[PDB]
Structure 1
Amino acid sequence: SKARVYADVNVLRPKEYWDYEALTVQWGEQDDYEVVRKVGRGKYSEVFEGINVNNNEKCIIKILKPVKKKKIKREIKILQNLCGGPNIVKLLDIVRDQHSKTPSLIFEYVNNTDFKVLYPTLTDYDIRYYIYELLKALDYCHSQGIMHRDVKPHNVMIDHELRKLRLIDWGLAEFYHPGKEYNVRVASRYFKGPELLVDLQDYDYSLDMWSLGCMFAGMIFRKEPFFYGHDNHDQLVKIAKVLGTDGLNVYLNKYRIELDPQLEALVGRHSRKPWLKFMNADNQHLVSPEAIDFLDKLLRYDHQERLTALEAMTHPYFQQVRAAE
């Protein structure tokens, strides 16, 4: 398997673009940035609103938990490669504690509203709008030779009053190289593609398009998360209960993959459930034939069959958003 687009980007670029292991970090001044208040957190970090003492501007400070040289250089390099692209969070500076040498990444500030409070208030048009903004980001990083590998609402920051969107947390991102076999332990569970769940390791940018379909589905049907599995095997089963096992089977045959026996039994046999059966009284104002058609073309087993980011931005679902632009 190889990507159907952007496949030779890293082949054509000079090796310094992608050989992140060769990077030498140019540390900035730790004292330039002061912590004002905690605002988020995760497995690999703690995040605060900060102030740049030089200009008194707001910023975001991501203090890293102890991390391997290899891992952090990958995140920094990718962020520097993407800085300035459409709706990509901007990395402003890199600094670290002298005594402990704990690294911090410094980012632009965003007045985000957690998706559990904000998404219930979004109109039909609002949803088209914000998802179009997310696609710009994704087409950009793919075209720069990079897969995000952790798309999900928690990693999409939004200022609703300004209506501005940023794609954050580049911790799992990686450069695409034709035929390379990748680690499948990426993404977040409710958003993992079938490739990750059946151990197909030569995957590509198209993984991110599955994750986006998962997110999009949660929003129009107001059912979050859409595929609600408890573990990786159950995750594959919940998908199978909607998409159907026949297409899962044609998928495994073409890639010549075999399911763990245990897996196979849990999955079972199931007929496809059409998307209007998800429609109901709390979501009836958001489900339209164009929303469903766009969704349908993202959530496919065969990664090679999904819309690219570039194709998705042209779907008539977004026609109004494009016209306003």
Structure 2
Amino acid sequence: QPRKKRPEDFKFGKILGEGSFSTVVLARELATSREYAIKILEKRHIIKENKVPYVTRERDVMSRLDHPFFVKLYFTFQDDEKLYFGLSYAKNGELLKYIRKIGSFDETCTRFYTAEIVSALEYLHGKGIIHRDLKPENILLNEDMHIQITDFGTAKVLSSFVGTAQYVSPELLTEKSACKSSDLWALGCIIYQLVAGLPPFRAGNEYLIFQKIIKLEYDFPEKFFPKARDLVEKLLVLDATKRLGCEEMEGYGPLKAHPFFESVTWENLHQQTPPKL
């Protein structure tokens, strides 16, 4: 292994994001001229907030990921005060940014980007990992406009936490429990959001949002692509064992065979050129 890196190896630049117990800063490695997104965490603060398990899980999950649709962990190091995670830099920022920029996606772009997420979730779920906080804020875009999923501090490794209100699955509200199917619920909310321009469940506060979620209280705009609508109806299902893509429904095959995805070639999405937004 190369010698441990250290802060003085980098020219630090702008802050890219100010996460839960961390700050992500753009950094250029002097020796190589490579750009990394370095996640910086203060040890004392992590210890004080009882987040050692949190940070340990984050690093352990990220070390296991080796797929182009996920953030990559290249290196770690620490000094007296801080932990540093050297992560891939997603040049084009958040999916959410593009949703707001152009309002909503046409069918071709919805299909292409939904497929990348599904394909990413298939990989993740095959390793026994649940994300638990999947959302357009955490789905980044690379320079090449392919997705790069991030934010694994709150992930669960199969064999205690509630995500972002608008994407929380009903089972989390009624049991405290999460499963792979919880990510598929999030996927349904995201597809709806790509097409409609807004998340399905919206209200004045978390309480009222949680209320709508458990009553499955939402509806589709008039223009909603019919096959995407059918797909979302098969994902936004209160019973977690009946969502398209979960094990009880025989996995990712039937999800990927959905009519909405008819024209998708699943084997080499990362080699395809994304539709212009």
Normalised TM-score (structure 1): 0.71
The aligned residue for residue 291 of structure 1 is 228
Q: C-alpha displacement at 1:97, in angstroms?
A: 2.2
Residue 42 (str. 1) matches residue 19 (str. 2): yes
1:191 partnered with 2:167: yes
Aligned-partner SS, 2:144: coil
Which stretches in structure 2 are left out of the alignment for 5+ residues? 246-250, 269-277
Counterpart Cα distance in 2 of 1:142 and 1:109: 24
Residue correspondences, number? 251
Candidates 105, 122, 145, aligned match of 1:163: 145
How far residue 314 of structure 1 moved from its aligned partner, in angstroms, is 2.5
Question: 1:164, 1:63 → 2: CA distance?
Answer: 25
Question: Partner of 1:146 in structure 2?
Answer: 129
Q: Distance in 2 between matches of 1:27 and 1:75?
A: 20
Q: CA–CA distance in 2 between the matches of 1:174 and 1:46?
A: 22
Equivalent in the alignment of 1:258: none
Matches within 5 A, 1:172-251: 172-177=154-159, 183=160, 185-201=161-177, 203-223=178-198, 225-240=199-214, 243=216
Q: CA offsets per residue over residues 3-52 of structure 1, 9 Å max, x none?
A: xxxxxxxxxxxxxxxxxxxxxxx964333333111122222221121112
The alpha-carbon distance between structure 1 residues 80 and 298, as it changes in their structure 2 partners (threshold 3 A), is same
Q: Secondary structure at the match of 2:148?
A: strand
Deviations 1:247-288 (A, max 9, x none): xxxxxxxxxxxxxxxxxxxxxxxxxx653xx22xxxx3xx22
**1:66-105 alpha-carbon deviations (Å, 9 max, x no partner):** 32332221111111111x124111001111123x2x1111
1:189 partner letter: A
**Distance in 1 of aligned mates of 2:155 and 2:29:** 27
- Structure 2 distance, partners of 1:198, 1:230, is 21
Alpha-carbon distance between aligned partners in 2 of 1:147 and 1:230, rounded to the nearest angstrom: 29
In the alignment, structure 1 residue 321 sits paired with structure 2 residue 264: yes
C-alpha RMSD over aligned residues: 2.3
Supply the distance in 1 between the matched residues of 2:56 and 2:228 (Cα, whole angstroms).
39
After superposition, the Cα gap between the structure-2 partners of 1:323 and 1:171, relative to the gap in structure 1 and judged at 3 Å, is closer
Cα displacement (A) at 1:153 = 0.4
- Identify if the C-alpha distance between structure 1 residues 200 and 240 changes in structure 2 by more than 3 Å, giving closer, same or farther: closer
Secondary structure at the counterpart of residue 307 of structure 1: coil
User: Which residue in 1 is equivalent to 2:248?
Assistant: none
Over residues 208-234 of structure 1, what are the superposed CA-to-partner deviations in whole Å (9 max), with x where a residue is unaligned?
A: 1111111111121122x3212455532
Of 290, 299, 303, which residue of structure 1 is paired with 2:240?
303
Distance 1:199 1:230 in 2: 24
Secondary structure at 2:172 match in 1: helix
Aligned to 1:39, what secondary structure does the other structure show? strand
Letter in 2 for 1:36: G
Describe the shift of the 1:175–1:324 C-alpha distance in structure 2 as closer, same or farther (beyond 3 A): closer
Go from structure 1 to structure 2 and tell me whether the alpha carbon gap of 1:176 and 1:116 turns closer, same or farther (over 3 Å shift). closer
Q: Distance in 1 between matches of 2:266 and 2:157?
A: 34
How far apart in 1 are the matches of 2:151 and 2:4? 20
Determine if the alignment matches structure 1 residue 31 to structure 2 residue 8.
Answer: yes
- In structure 1, C-alpha distance between the alignment counterparts of 2:219 and 2:78, rounded to whole Å: 52
Normalized against structure 2, the TM-score is what? Answer: 0.82
1:77 aligns with 2:77: no
State, as a whole percentage, how many aligned pairs show the same letter: 27
Tell me: CA distance 1:74–1:36, structure 2 relative to 1, closer, same or farther (3 Å): same
